[PDB]
RNA sequence: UACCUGGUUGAUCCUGCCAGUAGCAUAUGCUUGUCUCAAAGAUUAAGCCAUGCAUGUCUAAGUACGCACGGCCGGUACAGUGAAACUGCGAAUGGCUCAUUAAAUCAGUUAUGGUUCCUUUGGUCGCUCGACUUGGAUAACUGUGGUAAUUCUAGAGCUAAUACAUGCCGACGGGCGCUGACCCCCUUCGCGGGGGGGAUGCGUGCAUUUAUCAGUGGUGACUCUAGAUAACCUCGGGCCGAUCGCACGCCCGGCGGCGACGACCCAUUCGAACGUCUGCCCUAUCAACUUUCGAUGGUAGUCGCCGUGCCUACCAUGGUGACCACGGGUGACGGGGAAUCAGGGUUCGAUUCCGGAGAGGGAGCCUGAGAAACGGCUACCACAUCCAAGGAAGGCAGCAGGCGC
RNA sequence: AGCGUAUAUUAAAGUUGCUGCAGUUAAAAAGCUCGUAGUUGGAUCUUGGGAGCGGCCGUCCCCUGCUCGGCGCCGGCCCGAAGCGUUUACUUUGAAAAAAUUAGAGUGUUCAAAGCAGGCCGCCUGGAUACCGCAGCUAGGAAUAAUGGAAUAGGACCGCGG
């Protein structure tokens, strides 16, 4: 059907090839997955050798990684902002590999607070009134507190990250082919990558 | 200077967001006694298809032509000359076969007429299957 | 071809089988197994053509379905099972044991061995490997995977394995000054002492071998088998002892034995 | 065996062709006693086909309550042979023809460190810390039917599994990694300090997807293989045996060997696939060709078993050519080879071996490890069979054979 | 026990000519010079030495350096190994090259075409060998023919500041 072959298109010299055989199967080709954002929907494609290949047609969750301290959590994709290849893949917000998405910052914040015993986001004059957040931020023995005061030293977050946390949504880049593995796994944008992409989103936006 | 294309250009193996308080570079000697040249280690360019600072393995043939054209993007046309031997008349005939070959921005200045050594790699584009590995400046070319 | 091929024509059959033309159209396409299609000896060929125990492929079928023939200490009820190099074929009811090692010419000789020698075989290691728990792995020339080997054994050595346990006893390192039988190319069956190994990065490394009588010949490294340390083979050899004398010498020896018979 | 003879002239010496001369292989004419080998609807029509055959298959070892045959004491299920049917496998090989196809096919040479692989052979399969055997359908069978018709099948009642589903218990007590009550110790009179034990909780195996750290074995070279940490796990769902046959055993209702079958992963065998370098007949009354609907490159995707303009989007202006590109022709499938030969050579190679392509012409797909399959299905174009006129069924370039040529 | 005919094709055909044809008059030299590809291009750079043995003669061997062991000898001399050494054609060697056919060794298919069999009073034996252009791989040789090095000295080597 959808042919994936070299013999259908002109030689290096601009001379036409006359096809010496009809379409073979291994010269295969199938329609594009076109993965949207919605409730989990995955169809299975049986491929050469009797192996499987999962078509994610809708996805909500995704395994994203805060790379600077090896904090990976399953979060909830909310929307797409910028795609490098094509900008109709933004309009009809398709999930493809290496597209910029926004994710829920809540599992990263929860880990950050429970690891450093310091607040992240939570704007000045934050009423922490359930006060089991204050349990996670206070009430230790002696030597355990020494370990936690030792560690809070190197919890200096990049201001670019700290804004996104306080807004409540982080930028991430999809590192897995979602149309072939049925997964929207990626990494949270940081440093020079983040400054590059934040310029690109603002510039395009206007 | 770099990162002209819409997607962020990085050597995808090296991680550049290690918390602290220069950028590192990934490269390799590509075997067969080829000196991984100085620009590979001390450049700040990005290339998928550089045999030194990229993901291509050199294996199979090692051929050599003369640089003919340098008018396409990170690619050049070399011209390979040989004598085909007709059998009936106990004489030769001068033939040629010019191939599109991938030139890394590693080799900073090559001039049309320079001698190139090329190593076979996987198919890089429609017609490109070879990589420039060392350049030998044409007869003299000092001034 | 729309899939794997199952018929092998008699003219396409490997030449070392010495199959006659006017018998049929086909030869026995060897069933998949440890050795390659090209370089094996199918059990029907060895049993019917070489030994002359059977006359037809149906007679060989009638033998092999009584569990008589044992290849490498296991019963093989497949008449086109590929029996290849170094393989040990023990028939119990007759009380006979054969090791398939090459004649001095490019074919398999029918070399009888003793009950005590038909208990092991030499395997050329093909690739060393680490598993899924830093457990080292061997792969041999006859498709055997041996895990937890000796930590010195490397990619071109020879190992002596036992045909009950399938475990490594002793091994011969691939060195200069070690006996090697040549198991591929023009010099097929030539025994000699390794003189040199010539390294070519990216190409096939050629290895120089010295025969007993000062005959020097090269072969690609792949087609060599270290069968002994020094001049001492760890197996028994056929009559000839892998020299491959010239055609003028073979003539002289033939008509010497002829005229002596008279 | 490196060969020449007749014919322009009144006669001569030349150029030059015509005609002889010997193979070869298609047809043909006349003649044809023995014996051994042996080509044979290729050229024209890859034109059209009546008829019949050419692909099926069971072991002790998946499922037998068909009396269809059957051994005796049967009352503790099945003795034993075995049609049918379900299941499993094969039907992708073999055979036929040469219409296509001119760097295509194909031949030698190398690459997969850029992939998939039924079967075989060998590894793995209490590595995981949380039931002395489960479930509801269906066939053969029994019976009730349809239309003119075919290997069409609707309805009812009965029953199986290695079909289709669902699932423990084990080994199993812990181990490792975080978490961390709390605890005791020695020093500073004292804070602080140094190391020790450790409750509760969460996580764990291989494969799978992603991110980070370290540098047991290997390569000419890995972004290899192993190892470490933080998560994931497709409900169209990876594994971690609800299986079958012979031998029957070893102590107080205790107690295990040969095999068959099955399986995620690994290597191996059989391959396949896409690439590397060099190589092809005639043609200039074919000199310029290719491209904003892919032509040559760059970046990021999509798709595919994978590498790639294969295809999307945005960029760049490139690629090939007198060393013959682009176009056209072939009574062109390529090669191993064949005829003829002093030495060079010329011509042939549909034809039994290897490789390719096709099944009337194109196109699209199901199933499977492998098919764009045609002794598979679905359309349209050409042809064409049977019609109770509503419908049903086609594919000889398989083996025979018929018309046409 | 075969011979005649028709047609495609090979030798004859030195009548397609690379080996190997012709071009004043038999068929044939552009009217004439210029000119890029193509083809072809003068001479010149290692001669000459050490020693062996047969009858002044004939052939055999001896001609660039910079880290790990024993023939050992006393950090050294020697021999070896893993590396290095203007490119290219040429030539010789080695590897790798499916069978069948062809050439070709053995063998009384009754001979022969073939066939891969057979032979000796259980035994003894074959099933060889060559050939396979061109391109790719590998190791010797260095005549012949291309190609490179110092000339704005940004030359080689040797040392000192760095």
DSSP state letters, B117-129: EEEE-S--SSS--
Taking Cα atoms as reference points, which of A82, A94, A100 lies closest to residue A58? A94
By the CB < 8 Å criterion, does B18 face chain A?
yes
CATH code, domain carrying B108? 2.40.50.1000
Instruction: For chain C, count helices (H), then strands (E).
Output: 3, 19
Taking Cα atoms as reference points, which of C208, C203, C204 lies closest to residue C219? C208
Distances (CA, A) of C257 to C84, C243, C254: 32, 19, 5
By the CB < 8 Å criterion, does A68 face chain B?
yes
Structure tokens at C32: 């998949």
Method: cryo-EM
Q: Cα dihedral angle (C231, C235, C236, C242), rounded to 10 degrees? A: -50
Count of structural domains, chain B: 1
Q: How big is the CA angle at B5 (ends A206 and B7), to the nearest 5 degrees?
A: 80
- For tokens 């050595």, the residue is C157
Per DSSP, what are the bridge partners of residue A101? A80, A172
Chain B residue whose CA is closest to C199: B32
SS3 C60: helix
Determine the Cα–Cα distance for residues A44 and C230; give it in Å rounded to an integer.
Answer: 61
Q: Which residues of A touch B21 (CB under 8 A)?
A: 154, 156
SS3 C254: helix
Gap from C60 CA to D71 C1', Å: 38
Structure letter (DSSP) for residue C47: I
Q: Which residue is nearest to nucleotide D116 (CA to C1')?
A: A49
**What phi-psi label fits residue C202: left (phi over 0), alpha (psi between -120 and 50 degrees) or beta?**
left
C53 CB-contact burial (10 Å; exposed 0-12 / middle 13-18 / buried 19+)? middle
Strands (E), chain C: 8-9, 26-27, 41-42, 69-71, 82-83, 88-91, 96-99, 111-113, 120-130, 136-140, 145-147, 158-162, 168-172, 178-182, 191-198, 206-210, 216-220, 224-229, 232-233
Q: Which residues of B touch A115 (CB under 8 A)?
A: none
Nearest nucleotide to the CA of A114, by C1', is D179
- For tokens 């009797």, the residue is A50
Distances (CA, A) of A174 to A63, A86, A99, A195: 10, 15, 6, 17
> Are the beta carbons of C197 and C207 closer than 8 angstroms?
yes
**What phi-psi label fits residue A167: left (phi over 0), alpha (psi between -120 and 50 degrees) or beta?**
alpha
Determine the Cα–Cα distance for residues C24 and C243; give it in Å rounded to an integer.
Answer: 35
Taking Cα atoms as reference points, which of A9, A17, A95 lies closest to residue A56? A95
Structure tokens at A170: 């982080």
Structure tokens at A134: 């204050």
Residues of the domain holding B132 = 1-142
> Are the beta carbons of B123 and B93 closer than 8 angstroms?
no
> Are the beta carbons of B64 and B117 closer than 8 angstroms?
yes
Q: Which residues of A touch B5 (CB under 8 A)?
A: 84
A132 CB-contact burial (10 Å; exposed 0-12 / middle 13-18 / buried 19+)? exposed
Three-class secondary structure assignment of chain A: CCCCCCCCCCCCCCCCCCCCCCCCCCCCCCCCCCEEECCCEEEEEEECCCEEEEEEEEECEEEEEEHHHCEEEEEEEEEEEECCCCCHHHHCCCECCCCEEEEECHHHHHHHHHHHCCCCCCCCCCCCCCCCHHHHHCCCCHHHHHHHHHHHHHCCCCHHHHHHHHHCEEEEEECCCHHHHCCCCEEECCHHHHHHHHHHHHHHHC
> Are the beta carbons of C228 and C236 closer than 8 angstroms?
no
Beta carbons within 8 Å of A21's beta carbon, 6+ residues apart = none
Structure letter (DSSP) for residue B108: -
Nearest nucleotide to the CA of B63, by C1', is D277
Determine the Cα–Cα distance for residues B75 and B127; give it in Å rounded to an integer.
Answer: 11
Structure letter (DSSP) for residue C108: B
> Domains in chain A, ordered, with CATH?
1-30 (no CATH), 31-105+169-205 (no CATH), 106-168 (1.10.168.20)
Determine the Cα–Cα distance for residues B135 and B114; give it in Å rounded to an integer.
Answer: 7
SS3 B89: coil
Per DSSP, what are the bridge partners of residue A71? A66
DSSP of B17-67 = --------------STT----HHHHH-----SS-SSSSS----S-EE--EE
Confirm whether any atom of chain D, the nucleic acid strand, is less than 7 Å from CB of A141: yes
Q: Which residues of C touch B (CB under 8 A)?
A: 201-202
Per DSSP, what are the bridge partners of residue C252? none
SS3 C131: coil
Structure tokens at B119: 């190593």
> Are the beta carbons of C253 and C261 closer than 8 angstroms?
no
Determine the Cα–Cα distance for residues A135 and A114; give it in Å rounded to an integer.
Answer: 10
Confirm whether any atom of chain E, the nucleic acid strand, is less than 7 Å from CB of C197: yes
Distance from CA of B79 to the nearest CA of C (A): 25
Structure tokens at A89: 């893949």
Length of chain C: 262
Confirm whether any atom of chain D, the nucleic acid strand, is less than 7 Å from CB of B126: yes
Confirm whether any atom of chain E, the nucleic acid strand, is less than 7 Å from CB of C175: no
Confirm whether any atom of chain D, the nucleic acid strand, is less than 7 Å from CB of A90: no
Determine the Cα–Cα distance for residues A190 and C206; give it in Å rounded to an integer.
Answer: 54
Touching subunits for chain A (3+ Cβ pairs under 8 A) = B
> Are the beta carbons of C55 and C71 closer than 8 angstroms?
no
User: Which helix (DSSP H) or strand (DSSP E) does residue C257 occupy?
Assistant: helix C247-261
Determine the Cα–Cα distance for residues C141 and C156; give it in Å rounded to an integer.
Answer: 10
> Are the beta carbons of C221 and C207 closer than 8 angstroms?
yes
Beta carbons within 8 Å of A131's beta carbon, 6+ residues apart = none
Structure tokens at C208: 């120089």
Structure tokens at C28: 């026995």
Distances (CA, A) of C157 to B112, C39, C150, C168, C242: 50, 21, 12, 12, 21
Structure tokens at A48: 């050469």
> Are the beta carbons of C209 and C194 closer than 8 angstroms?
yes
Beta carbons within 8 Å of A201's beta carbon, 6+ residues apart = A81, A82, A100
C127 CB-contact burial (10 Å; exposed 0-12 / middle 13-18 / buried 19+)? exposed
């Amino acid at each position: 059907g959808i042919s994936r072959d070299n013999w259908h298109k002109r030689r290096k010299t601009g001379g036409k090839r006359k096809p010496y055989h009809k379409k073979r199967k291994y010269e295969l080709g199938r329609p594009a997955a076109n993965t949207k954002i919605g409730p989990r929907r995955i169809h299975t494609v049986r491929v050469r050798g009797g192996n499987k290949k999962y078509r994610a047609l809708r996805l909500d969750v995704g395994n994203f990684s805060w790379g600077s301290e090896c904090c990976t959590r399953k979060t909830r994709i909310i929307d797409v902002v910028y795609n490098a290849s094509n900008n109709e893949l933004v309009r009809t917000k398709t999930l493809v590999k290496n597209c910029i998405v926004l994710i829920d910052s809540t599992p990263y914040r929860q880990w950050y607070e429970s690891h450093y015993a310091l607040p992240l986001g939570r704007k000045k004059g934050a009423k922490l009134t359930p006060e089991e957040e204050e349990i996670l931020n206070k009430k230790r023995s002696k030597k355990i507190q020494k370990k936690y005061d030792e560690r809070k030293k190197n919890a200096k977050i990049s201001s670019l990250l700290e804004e996104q946390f306080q807004q409540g949504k982080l930028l991430a880049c999809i590192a897995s082919r979602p149309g072939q593995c049925g997964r929207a796994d990626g990494y949270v944008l940081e440093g020079k990558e983040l400054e590059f992409y934040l310029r690109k989103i603002k510039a395009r936006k206007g | 200077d770099i990162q002209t294309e819409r997607a962020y250009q990085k050597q995808p193996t090296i991680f550049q967001n290690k918390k602290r308080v220069k950028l590192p570079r990934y490269y390799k000697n590509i075997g067969l006694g080829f000196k991984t040249p100085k620009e590979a280690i001390e450049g700040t360019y990005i290339d998928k298809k550089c045999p030194f600072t990229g993901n291509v393995s050199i294996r199979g043939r090692i051929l050599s032509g003369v640089v003919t054209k340098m008018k396409m993007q990170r690619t050049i046309v070399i011209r390979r000359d040989y004598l085909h031997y007709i059998r009936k008349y106990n004489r030769f005939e001068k033939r040629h076969k010019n191939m599109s070959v991938h030139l890394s921005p590693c080799f900073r200045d090559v001039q049309i007429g320079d001698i190139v050594t090329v190593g076979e790699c996987r198919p890089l584009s429609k017609t490109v299957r070879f990589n420039v590995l060392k350049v030998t400046k044409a007869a003299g070319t000092k001034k | 071809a729309r899939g794997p091929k199952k018929h092998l024509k008699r003219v396409a059959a490997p030449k070392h089988w010495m199959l006659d033309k006017l018998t049929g159209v086909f030869a026995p396409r060897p069933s998949t197994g440890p050795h390659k299609l090209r370089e094996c000896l199918p059990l029907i060929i060895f049993l019917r053509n070489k030994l002359k125990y059977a006359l037809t492929g149906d007679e060989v079928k009638k033998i092999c379905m009584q569990r008589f023939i044992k290849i490498d200490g296991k019963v093989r009820a497949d008449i086109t099972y590929p029996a290849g190099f170094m393989d040990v074929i023990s028939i119990d009811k007759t009380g006979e044991n054969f090791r398939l090692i090459y004649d001095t010419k490019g074919r398999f000789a029918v070399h009888r061995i003793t009950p005590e020698e038909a208990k092991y075989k030499l395997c050329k290691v093909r690739k060393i490997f680490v598993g899924t728990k830093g457990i080292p792995h061997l792969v041999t020339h006859d498709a055997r995977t041996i895990r937890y080997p000796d930590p010195l054994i490397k990619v071109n050595d020879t190992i002596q394995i036992d045909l009950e346990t399938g475990k490594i006893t002793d091994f011969i390192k691939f060195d200069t000054g070690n006996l090697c039988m040549v198991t591929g190319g023009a010099n097929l069956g030539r025994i000699g002492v390794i003189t040199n190994r010539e390294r070519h990065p990216g190409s096939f490394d050629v290895v120089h071998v010295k025969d007993a009588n000062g005959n020097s010949f090269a072969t690609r490294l792949s087609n060599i088998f270290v069968i002994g340390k020094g001049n001492k083979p760890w197996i028994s050899l056929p009559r000839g002892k892998g020299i491959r004398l010239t055609i003028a010498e073979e003539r002289d020896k033939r008509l010497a034995a002829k005229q002596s018979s008279g």
